[model samples]
Target: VNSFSGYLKLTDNVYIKNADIVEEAKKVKPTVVVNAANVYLKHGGGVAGALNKATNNAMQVESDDYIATNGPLKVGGSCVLSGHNLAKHCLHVVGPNVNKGEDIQLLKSAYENFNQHEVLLAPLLSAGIFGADPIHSLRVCVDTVRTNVYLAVFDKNLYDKLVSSFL
Candidate 1:
């Protein structure tokens, strides 16, 4: 698939990949696959829906079960689920909405949830429907990642931006 684009290293073996987040993640066998979820942990749409649907909604079933036991995930909170072959686990994190303003700190907290993994895969936090600036989001993602992280992307322009900024 054209979705498998390319990748580059930032530091400490961190990679910024130009590809469909879930599709490429499946090939890498990461420790965790991140899902940008709603505060309620609903796999409603965007990356959330993509991950749930790609895995036959097993993520949804688990999320439903998690929310049933723990209640809504607060803005920067997160939950982990057993993965469906794409990785060892799925990290569902609730990032801040840019509409709420000054979303950097909360986004950092979300990616900090991204830290406790061996080989992790993720997109720029708060850059999807949550609508934070993608460039700023990339810096935050890069800063918080301390392990083997395939920081996936789906945009050619962002790919160029990444190359220009880093390579």
Candidate 2:
């Protein structure tokens, strides 16, 4: 399973999570490797939403230019739908249910890789994980990643978990 995007080849396991992905990537440490986890703002529309946000804004398509507000403006969800720039093209990580005490090595891997791979001052998207309050998720994410911007990843599980825990 291999894909050639421009000059990069994305193959199976390329997007595979877990500790191994980080280790192997670090061994060779390329100039840039897209962190699939940090790829989108958990559009609830999934990939389509991500692509839309990437190409255009939330609902304002066919505009003059494809410029956004530097960050994401979410519409709805159990989080801040339109305040912080949740997702972008640089890097964001979602792993280890912090509330559940799940390990955070996966999140750390991105930071380690960023430095090893020479990524400086990148917008760290870490929102939407479990739809937990973006604020709480962000606190752990920031304390963990310590980047310029730490967003969220609102997958269904994370969303549910956060809601249940908080409620």
lDDT of each: 0.77, 0.31
Off by over 4 Å in 1: 1-6, 100-102
List model 1 lDDT by residue over 59-164, tens digit each: 8888788888889988888888887867788888888988667456888788788667766778778887888888788787777767666777788788778668
Best candidate (score: lDDT): 1
**TM-score for candidate 2, residues paired by index:** 0.27
Count clashes in each candidate, considering only residues at least 3 apart in sequence or on different chains. 0, 15
Q: What's the C-alpha lDDT at position 4 in model 2?
A: 17
Question: RMSD for each model, in Å, please?
Answer: 3.5, 16.1
> Residue 108 of candidate 2: its Cα lDDT?
48
Candidate 1 Cα deviation (angstroms), residue 154: 1.0
Q: Report the Cα lDDT for residue 131, model 1.
A: 85
**10 residues in a row with least lDDT, candidate 2:** 75-84
What would you estimate as the lDDT of candidate 2? 0.31
What would the per-residue lDDT of candidate 2 be over residues 40-118, giving only the tens digit for each residue?
3343333224433543464224211222433432221111122113222223333333454544444544334333322
